């Protein structure tokens, strides 16, 4: 388990992180996490690791792009003083560019988006005990569907920023993968974006896994 | 693990199982099943098994003892044709005697609920794949308070019901006792009886465990 | 133009149709016939041929399935006395089978979808002066996509069934076809199949191309 | 179609143009529009000229006069910086007259509608590719109905001004004067003033006329 | 003045009459006779005249044409023994031949108009004391607009009923067609049917008068 | 009538004068007088005298003493430069002695209540035509009830206040005692205070005899 | 005191009784009880008299004369096998009289009051152990105001009947009159018979008092 | 009775005193003061001593520690000019430190919580006539239960604190402590802090004991 007794992990992104959480502070009392992934990432943890005495907080906003969180980092991560940042941002940075392909203003392209993001990491790295980078996804299994492939981009941007920075990963693009082998996106989602219970589980367990998480700890 | 590819999985009991779950169907659309262990059950089994094509069916009713579940099991259970049928009931048989300790007809005593139990298991088995029984349970760590000790009772009946038949059996007490070594009630559950979502999760990992879910697949 | 003077004109199909219609009646008053192609036919042929006198009735009910439309067909189709009847369905046909996989008896296979349509239009037939038949759709561009490739199969049924009646027939597939070779389906609809107003426009003027309007009346 | 690709269309006006448009910036995702002739304007172009990527905002407000747009002309049009503007009001400036006859301070007569809507023109004209000027109406046939004959003096001021400044030219009233030979006006609004979905149509029709629209485009 | 002490005044109608009054008593409790001319009379009469113990019901429901107050003419008058019944009907009968005009059947010709009034006032008359039949109105000026036109020809049938019975008689659209010699519809109405509070005293007032109400009582 | 065309006549008072009017403003536009007196009094006005053009003002604030009105004096009389100004306050001047009769703070005793309104008064008179001055009331036969018995002492001030200012006078407890004779005041009002619609005519009507309004205009 | 251990008491009456009790059980959960007296009592007998075990049912309705307490008795009280039952009624039996004097109807005049309350008490005693007769009270301090006086005169029914058969008795208005004579009723009541938290703690003391209850219990 | 006719008596703590209370100003007009204990002591001092004149505010807002008490003690006690000041604090100091373990900010331990208190009462005790000093309660017989041994160590401070300042002291936990020999805490409050009615009426009864409240008044 990465993540060590007494420690502040905070969440952002976007409305696959926010799900509803309570604004401003997403902390605590229940049903201030929301009831996505979030949440689940944080039942788990205390059922399993009650002893840890981990504080979560959830700052997604629905919405948002890489160029929104830029917008609030400052109040919304730095001046939290997390011990561990998850973040994932792209789906909207790149939705914006296929559902509102003529309000350019809102589209965020994949160079801007890079430095962007590997802005955020830069600045927040030295304050943190580490940072978990969570890549977009799109519930779409055929790589050459056009969101889909703009997706993978942005997908493989994040896992070059996060090798080059030393910060954890998680894909969750190949999580969906898997299981798109077998379920067709409506199964798992509205509109290859929002994901049911299911998906939301997916994500949850994906970051587990990627920080050392284990259902039946190790005696 | 024990549930099987294109079997149908029907949940009863009362509103730890119920949590808000679609009325009457249980079962057909995004939140159908409710936000809670029932719901995770589901997600994890999804998230894990895609391929094994589960049904699942959420009828719980919150308010329910035993005897209301006596009195709809025909339309709710059987007529539903399920393949397995788990069941966690006797939170509200017992709870009754002690909010409402002088509404007696409201109370679902040991021998009502031993019976009752026994039947509904008895008439049910012949008729389906298979049976879970899940013991009711009281989130307080002190087995001498009087609600718990009742509670503890309870779960005994549930327990060789379930020997008794040769049902699957999850111990929803043990699995919260572990947890509360650490944590006091309130910061589990509201009023020692409503899950957090991490509450569910212990719940949800409990029955999991019980039907051989692996969270990695050995392959 | 094929709808004449003083003729009662009935759509019937799934949510695509009622988009909000009034209940039971989908006639009289502002609002009545709902917000989508249905009120945008009628709003078109008014505005270009006010004097046609054409009584129109909108039975789309959300969620139908052809199962739903053969339940209803004698109170909402035959007692109406419609002079046209007009009849978009599949989409929730096909959708079930895709984004409720392991629900069987919701899905609507080929073989039950090409039966009970065609009995709905022979029966329907000698009691009426014409019956429009639109195909159902899926805003989706690759014919690869699965459930775009069953949508389109159900189509060819919808077409014989069209001309195995000597029906009008309306492809709105075809119509959204030719849109989505420039734009993406997110620009049109939610979920590929909720279209926006412009998606409605789409399916308004197929069928009004299909029916003989003039945008500007010849003279 | 005189509205080139790229280009932004601007309308404002009334509650006619209004029709419940997201406020403030009535652009774009679904709704944003409202729900009258300037949604069923984009749809209709969107169907037909999805290659064009015109961006269309709505800065319609319910009871406004020609005094009120110019009190907001620089935020709502200016500051846009449309390429066209289209612009239909007068049916406030006049109504005031009617039904509040003695708060005069809410009627705007026939000079100072006159000077002001020239004074809107002659400030956007260098700013912009093309002005398109609707003008208003009252659902009313005959010619001397007080309120109609009202009408009719200030849709002439807006030919007069359209000519003058050479800005695209809307009669509204010619429009419903030809569907009012045969339906009266409760069929087609409520209050003489507030069209249905037809008379929303009839406007959007008459507006895509004058721009050059085609039905079915030219090859 | 021609109502006496003790005796049960009944008011039946559409929505004119209705306006909001209790369903289904329409009698018995501040605001049971909803707000307009019935409240009015009442309120008058209980000002200047409180020893006259009137009982008065408001049986007007929103909608009704002539046909509907025969259906529920047992129940609503017949069964309330009332010692007065004034009616007011027309409005409806008429209006839906010009906002419907191709629902022919919501349509209340003249016909069926004269011989359904008639019919219910024969009927009525052997038991109660007196009627009161008041026209029905268009809030309009030009007699020859074609729905005002409409409406005055059938107050010539209620006028004829009226002497026919030997019944009392409000020509309400006399006392609107003073008014309207100043103001203009919308400065009384909405739609030229639903009058504003000014409306439903022209109204109130009529009636009063037509049954000897004193505004200051002799003495 | 001693109100001339084209004059501004404003309502100030408390619940009884408000009748929830819409605020700020009071004015015009049908619902905006509130639902009582006020409205009642220009119905008639509107109906008997439609072509006098008076605008009417409503000011009434629910629970003002006649300290509350001159706090806000200035701006929502003065400001509003009426012709006639007419004066209705003191019920809960009174009635907080009653039913608050240890919040002193809250209470306005005689001496403090008659110079206050004299302020009111001296301050108004030099500006319009004329004021009329309302005694508040309490429905309330017996005059020796307490708060019966110091209504009146109000309303004996406000007559003294009318004589000596020169202006009109309305004897609101008058008109009440005169129905009072036969109704017990829970026919009339809801707790001695608030009025039916009846009790609404009543002050209506003696305000209307107060300005010389004829029920039929002598020729 | 003379309620005992185990025992059920039934509380019937008007709004004063029910107060927002739960429908229909009137019993079973923190609320059921409503919001007045009732809680009170049995809120006292549970912080005094804890050990008591005594189950409460609240089967007030608001509204109800005499004549309705008959029409719903069998199920209402007969069916709830109590042992006790507690009865306040004639507030509205009166009421009727003088807030809708002219529905006679709707009065319950001494005759029918006397007989029916009666025939309820005689049909009751063979069947439970004890009955409270409550009179019912009007808060006034005038004995001559007429409403008062009718009241007083339904108490003096209520005595007899009360010792005619043996029941206990509380003179609810003698409560009243002691707090009369230091506060007026609009202190402690709206409108005379909705009384505030005080008022309900009269009539909560009254009973309280009749059936022995010690506010220190004497040991 | 030691509160003087008079004089002022405010109450301040969590949400045990707030219940709903109005705000800011806590005071009077029927329902104001909430509906918990506070209304129910001033119901009882209303019923018995209504000459008392008493006045009572309710300045108790649901979540505080006496830390919040600390931050609001000028503007809702000192500003306020109360006779008499009762404070019950303590259950929120300690909750947060059960149900949110390791949001330590949100805790107030037992040092920091005897000073916070000891400088409430030091700084109001010069201004006013006296201060009643309740002590928090936890509703739970086992006095070894974490919280329930918790809450003990504060109410021990607080009688420290009382005995020392010569405030007025009620020990709210032995108040339920001699109920609790007969109930379990589900039948009294819900979670083991919100009290029923009747537990309102313990903490009530507790505290007029304390003020010297009698029941039947000595004559
Ligand atoms: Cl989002
Ligand atoms: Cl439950
Ligand atoms: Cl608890
Ligand atoms: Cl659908
Ligand atoms: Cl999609
Ligand atoms: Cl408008
Ligand atoms: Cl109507
Ligand atoms: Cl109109
Ligand atoms: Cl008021
Ligand atoms: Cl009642
Ligand atoms: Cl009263
Ligand atoms: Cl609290």
């Not at 007494?6 to 229940?30: H, N, Q």
């Not at 920023?161 to 969750?172: G, Q, R, Y």
């Amino acid at each position: 388990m990465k993540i060590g007794s007494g420690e502040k992990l905070l969440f952002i992104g976007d409305s696959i992180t926010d799900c509803g959480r309570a604004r401003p502070e997403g902390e605590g009392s229940f049903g201030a996490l929301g009831t996505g992934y979030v949440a689940y990432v944080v039942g788990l943890l205390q059922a399993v690791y009650p002893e840890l005495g981990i504080r979560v907080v959830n700052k997604g906003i629905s919405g948002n792009t890489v160029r929104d969180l830029k917008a609030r980092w400052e109040e919304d991560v730095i001046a939290q003083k997390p011990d561990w940042v998850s973040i994932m941002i792209g789906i909207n940075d790149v939705w914006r560019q296929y559902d509102l392909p003529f309000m350019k203003e809102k589209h965020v392209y994949l160079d801007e988006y890079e430095a962007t993001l590997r802005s955020l990491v830069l600045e927040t790295k030295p304050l943190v005990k580490g940072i978990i980078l969570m890549t977009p996804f799109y519930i779409e299994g055929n790589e050459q569907d056009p969101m889909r492939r703009t997706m993978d981009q942005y997908g493989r941007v994040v896992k070059q920023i996060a090798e080059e920075t030393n910060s954890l990963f998680v894909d969750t693009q190949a999580a969906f993968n898997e299981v798109l082998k077998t379920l067709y996106p409506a199964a798992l989602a509205w509109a290859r974006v929002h994901p049911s219970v299911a998906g939301h589980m997916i994500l949850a367990r994906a970051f587990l896994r990627e920080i050392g998480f284990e259902w039946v700890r190790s005696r």
